Amino acid sequence: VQNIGGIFIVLAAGLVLSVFVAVGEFLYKSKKNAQLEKRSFCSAMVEE
Amino acid sequence: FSKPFMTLGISILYRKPNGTNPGVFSFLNPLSPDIWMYVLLACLGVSC
């Protein structure tokens, strides 16, 4: 556990980063919705 | 002394060591069992 060790940090912090880009995709697509729908208020609500 | 009636030589002496019995689960062996238990946790963990 001492010796493998560090890739589990990479395993942990890797999928932490993917949470932030999944929101980064989601807001960007609600902005694609905001071309067709409201400003920032109900364009994000209707998607979920 | 008389002339000797039979000879010898200085040897050493030790047990015929064992029947070897290697691990029937020694494929599991080269890691920590916890790391196996962590990756199977990480198996479903990354999946979920």
Side-chain angles (χ1 to χ4, degrees):
Chain A
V1 179
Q2 293 295 109
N3 206 161
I4 297 97
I7 67 169
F8 293 101
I9 303 298
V10 178
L11 183 63
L15 278 74
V16 174
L17 183 63
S18 178
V19 176
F20 291 163
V21 69
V23 178
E25 292 179 353
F26 182 75
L27 295 175
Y28 182 74
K29 191 264 188 295
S30 68
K31 185 173 72 68
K32 293 183 183 293
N33 294 117
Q35 299 295 321
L36 295 174
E37 294 292 328
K38 298 299 290 182
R39 185 177 179 179
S40 178
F41 291 160
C42 293
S43 296
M45 295 296 173
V46 68
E47 189 69 27
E48 290 182 354
Chain B
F1 296 101
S2 65
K3 289 181 181 179
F5 46 85
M6 81 281 202
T7 177
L8 55 83
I10 296 171
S11 296
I12 65 99
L13 181 62
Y14 183 73
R15 177 180 287 274
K16 293 182 285 291
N18 56 5
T20 179
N21 193 0
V24 68
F25 293 101
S26 178
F27 60 92
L28 191 38
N29 195 3
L31 296 174
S32 296
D34 289 330
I35 298 297
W36 290 98
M37 185 271 287
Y38 290 163
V39 65
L40 281 41
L41 190 280
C43 182
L44 281 73
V46 176
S47 301
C48 292

